[PDB]
Structure formats: C-alpha cells, structure tokens
C-alpha cells in the first residue's frame, strides 16, 4: 500500500492511495485503499489523508473521514485527531497501521501504531525527512 | 505553506528481518519521490498532480506493494486498487480489482476526470480505461520474485 | 428507546400526476407487509441485524423494487447487484458489489461479514466465495422484468433525443 | 435501491442497503449502496443509516457516516443532522435522494429532497406508517 497527501501554494489539498492488497488475498477482497473516507480523503476545509494497515478496520472506523470529521465538527487539532483515530479507536477494533495527513494550515502528521511505516515528508523549498521505524 | 507526505505501507516492517542494505534502498526511494513532489510544489504544480505523480512513482517502484511489485492473491494473480480525491471540489476517482492497468492511480484519475462516476471495478473499470486510450498491460508485469517467495512462505 | 424499523424502496422522481391509486396501492401493500414482518420480528426479540437482513431480503424478492428481482438493467442489458449490511453492536460490516449470479446480495453481504475475515468482496471473486460457502448460483435473467427493460428502452430513446 | 434500519429490544442498531444500481449504467460502476459510511452505516453509540439517491454525491459526502459524525462530534439531533445532510449539503453538491435513520434513543427520520421516497416505519407493537410522496 502506498499513498501521498499534498497542500499546494494555492491552498488546495489532495490525497491518493494505491495497493496490490495482501499476500495470499482471497480474490475479490477490497480493503480501505479505494474507498473514499476509509483509505483516502481530501477536503480543503479540513485535511488530506492516505491510510495503510488492516483494511477491514480502516473501513469499519472510516479512518480517513473520521480525522476530517473530528477536526471539522469536533474542533480537534490534526495531532489530537490522529492520536484519537490511530492510537485509540483503530486498536480498540483490532486495527493496526497508520496514515499521513496534511491539514489546510500545512500541519503534517504521520501517525502509526505498527513497528514500521515507510514514510517521508517535506516543506517546499526545504529538506525532506524519511522514516522507517519510530 | 506548501508540503507533501508519502507512505509505502505500515505493518509489513520488522527490524529483525531487515538488512541495512534493504533499509537504504527504501530510504533512497522514499527520499527521491518526496523530492520529486517538493520540486513540483515549489514550481506551482497542483496538490492533485503532485499526489498523482508521487503515487505513480511508488507504483512503478518494485519495492512497494502497488503497481509493479504488487503482492500476489491466493490464485497467484494481481488485483490492484487505488483512489484519488481533490479537496477543492470533493471530486474523487477509484478503481478496485484491476489486473490489466499499469498505474491504478492514473485509472482512478481517469474515472474522476473523464466519467461522471467515483468508483469503477473489474473488467468494466478496465474497458472504461481502454476506451479512453489507457494501454492494456499483461498482468505478469507487476510480478516480482520477492513477492512470489512471500506467497510460497505464506502457504 | 422503543424498538423500531424503517424501510425504503428508493428516492426519486415519483410523479403523482403519472400514478393511479391502483399502482400506488401495490407499493403501499408491499411496504406495509415488509415493515409489519420487521415489527413482528422486533416484538419477538429478534436482533436488529436479522430484522434489517430480512426486510431487505423481502425488498430484493419483491419485483417492484430495484434490488434483486426487478433490478434495473445496465447499458449491456445485464444486472450488476450491490449490497451492504452493518452491525452497530460489533461495527462488523459485510458487502458485495457487481454480482450477477447471487439471488439475494444482502445475504451474500451478511455471509462476507460472518464467514470471512473481510468487509467487501466484488465480482466473480464475491460469487466464488459465496458458492464455496454453499450459497446457490442463479441465472442472471432471474432478476429481469418487463417494466425495468421498458425503462432501459426509454432511457436509450431519451439519449438519442 | 432498498434499505432497512432497526433498533431492537436489546438496544442494537443495524442497517442494510441493496440495489441493482441505475438504468443504462456503465458496467463496473459502484454507487454508495455497498460502501460502508456512504450508503450504509450502523453504530450502537449513534445511528443506523440506509441511503438512496445520486450515488457519487453520497460517496463524496460520506452521507451515512456524516449523520453519525454530525450527531457525535457536532452535537446535532437526528432531525438537525438529516436536514443538514439531505436538505442542504447533498443538494449543494448537486445530489438528490434520501435516507432512513434510527438513533440510539429510538428517534426515526426519513428525509428526502426528491418528489418521492418509497418508505414505511413503525415501533414494535404499534401500527406502521407507509408513504410515497412528500
Ligand atoms: Cl404518501
Ligand atoms: Na510498486
Ligand atoms: Na426487488
């Protein structure tokens, strides 16, 4: 599973997610990656999110949109919303994984509850950071 | 102001099984793709084109379980899925269960921009793509020895 | 609060002008029988999950409603059926999209939920999973009705106009 | 499209949605009906929602889950949430249709912005109500 979120110089947010799914997958299974609000969501009023982990749980908790809803309706910070969803609600359902999120203010979060998440980020005209482990 | 984050998946990663030479390969790929994305954003490209290109590169990179280097299903096939969403319009495109398209994220983007639909699945998604001029690929192009060995291990 | 059921058979351009009381009464009697089935089940202590499963199974079975038997037709004069079921207790969910050979998509969706580790299955993959679990394979023409075919012929005529 | 929502004697909420899609549909197209949080959603702590309408807008707006989030995070009543989603947001986005919803307090709502929605509801051991038009 791979993903990208971006805030551009004009204040627009976008997200994308792509996957081959899981090793030994039952043919016909669909995880969170292609489902709007589960594995992918973007809204200029809130946040761009791409998810990765136990796809069944990201669907049942609508992880991507839940970040957006907590911020939009709840008034939570990007950091509060990410902590709630990734660190509390997903594990409560037996979910593991993480996501990348950029809010309308260009705040960035890359939460995960797993041992690893292949990830990288950087501000435009600035030096990028990569990451594997915590 | 402008900023990009990317990921190549969570949960698949264990220090005790990784070599440092594998870690470096991943750091290089992640760093090269986020940089492509940064240059695009500095040059005034849209968030939509930027996330599209970033995910296209992650698809093309055999290190990542998307497009080339996709995991295998129980039937030793590849079934690919992708979504893209524009925060300005709430417009979104998505394909699920595609086998004969090289870049799912570009198929998802074709559904968004060249259909009234959000989500297309299976042969119908592929026929829609082909009709709009997207190339049909043989499904073996995504197959990698590393992923195939992981399938045999899982059994 | 009090146990309760709501059902729908779809929102859209339902034109009082066009309809006769006699046509309307076919819809009202179908809706009334189905909701009464669900109320009876709720009164007997049946689960919300089994009540919504059964109400939607009956709406599928009823040719008046665009689900299972009486499904609208694709551009290709085929039927592609989709369904979802979700349990507010466990937050488990089951869903199928683009199935043509399963009589009751809501029962396949429930089967995904109960007899797989998964939430969503599509296409032939969904059909093979349900067959393997012992759900029957049907001919795609069992859903076909004259009223929906005539609606496809009218949409085609409009398109050329 | 068709759907049911229920609150049982034990306080469980559930929701189911089924469809044949739309007349003259492009083969492979998927509407809100089978998508958790779009055409179908149920959570004991909030609501059971089944939707019907312009599938692309109910996906993009995550109509079913949005009802849940508006109530839980926004503190809206079921009636306020249904008005917001069905009578304001979905029409602004260019969508039409309706939904059925039961909250954890046994309130029931059958909003729609179309001419008709085929519908019925009834409390256990009470007389049912049926309806077609506004
Ligand atoms: Cl009426
Ligand atoms: Na790849
Ligand atoms: Na029917």
DSSP assignment string, B71-116: PPBTTS---EEEEEEETTTTEEEEEEEESS-S-HHHHHHHHHHHSS
> Could you give phi then psi for residue D67, rounded to 5 degrees?
-60, -45
Closest Cβ–Cβ partner in B15, B88, B105 for A44: B88
Dist. CA B103 → ligand 2 center (Å) = 9
Q: Give me the domain span that covers residue B51.
A: 20-154
At A69, list the tokens. Answer: 């809803």
Strand order in the sheet with D97-103: D40-42, D47-53, D97-103, D108-109
What resolution in angstroms does the PDB record give?
2.1
What's the CA gap between D125 and D134, in Å, rounded?
A: 26
What's the CA gap between A117 and D67, in Å, rounded?
A: 32
At B137, list the tokens. Answer: 């690929």
3-state secondary structure of C52: helix
Residue entry with tokens 């809803």: A69
In contact, B87 and A14? CB cutoff 8 Å = yes
Which ligand neighbours the alpha carbon of C66 most closely? 3
Using the Cα atoms of residue D38, residue B71, residue C127 and residue A96 in order, give the sign of their dihedral. negative
What's the CA gap between D87 and D71, in Å, rounded?
A: 16
- Let me know if domain A2-131 sits in CATH 3.40.1190.20: no
What's the CA gap between C34 and C31, in Å, rounded?
A: 5
- Which of these, A53, A84, A44, lies nearest to A67 by C-alpha position? A84
What letter would DSSP give residue B132?
Answer: T
- Cross-strand bridge partners of residue D51: D99
For chain B, give the longest Cα–Cα distance.
48
What letter would DSSP give residue C74?
Answer: B
At B113, list the tokens. Answer: 């921009």
What's the CA gap between C104 and C86, in Å, rounded?
A: 16
At D129, list the tokens. Answer: 């109500």
> Could you give phi then psi for residue A63, rounded to 5 degrees?
-50, -55
In contact, D4 and C7? CB cutoff 8 Å = yes
Q: How many CB atoms lie within 10 A of CB B115?
A: 16
Pure H helices in C44-87:
48-61
Measured CA distances, B127 to B81, B89, B111, D90 (Å): 16, 26, 12, 30
Query: Is A93 within 8 Å of C93 when comparing Cβ atoms?
Result: no
Strand order in the sheet with C4-12: A29-30, C120-122, C93-99, C81-87, D13-19, D2-7, C4-12, D116-123, D129-133
Residue C118: inside a domain, yes or no?
yes
- Cross-strand bridge partners of residue D47: D103
Kindly list the residues from chain D whose CB atom is less than 8 angstroms away from the CB atom of residue A35. 35-36
CA distance C55 to chain D (A): 6
Measured CA distances, C120 to A40, A65, C129 (Å): 16, 18, 11
- Which of these, C98, B105, C119, B38, lies nearest to A7 by C-alpha position? B38
In contact, B22 and A121? CB cutoff 8 Å = no
Question: Is there a catalytic annotation at residue D1?
Answer: yes
Dist. CA D117 → ligand 1 center (Å) = 9
Is D31 one of the annotated binding-site residues? yes
Residue B55: inside a domain, yes or no?
yes
Look at strands C93-99 and C81-87 and give their pairing: antiparallel
3-state helix, strand, coil in chain D (%, to 5): 25, 35, 40
Task: Please indicate the experimental technique that yielded this structure.
Answer: X-ray
At D91, list the tokens. Answer: 């029409």
What's the CA gap between C144 and A34, in Å, rounded?
A: 31
In contact, C121 and C129? CB cutoff 8 Å = yes
Compute the CA torsion angle B69, B71, B72, B78 (nearest 10 deg).
-60
What's the CA gap between D96 and D90, in Å, rounded?
A: 7
Residue C10: inside a domain, yes or no?
no
Contacts of C48 (CB under 8 A, 6+ apart): C87, C88, C89, D6, D7, D8, D12, D13, D14, D42, D48
What's the CA gap between D106 and D120, in Å, rounded?
A: 15
What's the CA gap between B40 and D103, in Å, rounded?
A: 47
CA distance D25 to chain B (A): 10
- Which of these, B122, B50, B111, lies nearest to B80 by C-alpha position? B122
Query: Is A29 within 8 Å of C124 when comparing Cβ atoms?
Result: no
Strand order in the sheet with B80-86: A129-131, A117-123, B3-10, A2-7, A13-19, B80-86, B91-98, B119-121, D29-30
Going from N- to C-terminal start, the domains of chain D cover: 2-19+29-120
Measured CA distances, A67 to A77, A88, C9 (Å): 9, 13, 33
What's the CA gap between B47 and A12, in Å, rounded?
A: 6
Closest residue of D to B122, CA-based? D28
Q: What angle (nearest 5°) sits at the alpha carbon of residue B62, between those of residues B59 and B65?
A: 60
In contact, B66 and B82? CB cutoff 8 Å = yes
Residue B4: inside a domain, yes or no?
no
What's the CA gap between A3 and B104, in Å, rounded?
A: 12
* Burial zone of D59 (CB within 10 Å; 0-12 exposed, 13-18 middle, 19+ buried): buried
Query: Is A93 within 8 Å of C91 when comparing Cβ atoms?
Result: yes
**Helix-then-strand count for chain D, H and E:** 4, 9
What's the CA gap between D1 and D50, in Å, rounded?
A: 10
What's the CA gap between B47 and B37, in Å, rounded?
A: 9
Classify domain D2-19+29-120 by CATH number.
Answer: 3.60.20.30
What's the CA gap between A5 and B55, in Å, rounded?
A: 10
> Could you give phi then psi for residue B148, rounded to 5 degrees?
-60, -40
What's the CA gap between B78 and B142, in Å, rounded?
A: 7
Dist. CA C16 → ligand 1 center (Å) = 9
Kindly list the residues from chain D whose CB atom is less than 8 angstroms away from the CB atom of residue B92. 59-60
At B146, list the tokens. Answer: 């590393």
At D68, list the tokens. Answer: 């849940």
Query: How many structural domains comprise chain B?
Result: 1
In contact, B124 and D27? CB cutoff 8 Å = yes
For chain C, give the longest Cα–Cα distance.
54
What's the CA gap between A78 and B70, in Å, rounded?
A: 31
CA neighbours closer than 13 Å in the CB half-sphere of residue B97: 26
Closest residue of D to A76, CA-based? D73
Q: What angle (nearest 5°) sits at the alpha carbon of residue D29, between those of residues A3 and D3?
A: 105
């Amino acid at each position: 599973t791979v993903g990208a979120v971006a805030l551009d110089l004009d204040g627009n947010l976008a997200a994308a997610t792509s996957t081959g799914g899981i090793t030994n997958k039952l043919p016909g299974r669909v995880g969170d990656s292609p489902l709007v609000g589960a594995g992918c969501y973007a809204n200029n009023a809130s946040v761009a999110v791409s998810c990765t982990g136990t796809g069944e749980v990201f669907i049942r908790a609508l992880a991507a949109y839940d970040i957006a809803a907590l911020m939009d309706y709840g008034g939570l910070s990007l950091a509060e919303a990410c902590e709630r969803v990734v660190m509390e609600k997903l594990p409560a359902l037996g979910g593991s994984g993480g996501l990348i999120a950029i809010d309308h203010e260009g705040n960035v979060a890359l939460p995960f509850n797993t041992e690893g998440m292949y990830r990288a980020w950087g501000y435009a005209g600035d030096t990028p950071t990569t990451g594997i482990y915590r | 102001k402008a900023v990009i984050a990317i990921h190549g998946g969570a949960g698949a990663i264990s220090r005790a099984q990784m070599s440092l030479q594998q870690e470096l390969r991943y750091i290089e790929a992640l760093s090269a793709i986020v940089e492509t994305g940064q240059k695009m954003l500095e040059a005034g490209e849209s968030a939509l084109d930027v996330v599209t290109e970033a995910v296209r590169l992650l698809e093309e990179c055999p290190l990542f379980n998307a497009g080339i280097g996709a995991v295998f299903t129980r039937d030793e096939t590849h079934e690919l899925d992708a979504c893209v969403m524009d925060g300005n319009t709430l417009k979104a495109g998505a394909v699920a269960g595609v086998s004969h398209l090289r870049n799912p994220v570009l198929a998802a983007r074709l559904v968004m921009e060249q259909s009234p639909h959000v989500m297309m699945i299976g042969e119908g998604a592929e026929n829609f793509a082909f009709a709009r001029g997207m190339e049909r690929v043989s499904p073996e192009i995504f197959s990698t020895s590393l992923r195939y060995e992981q399938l045999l291990a899982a059994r």
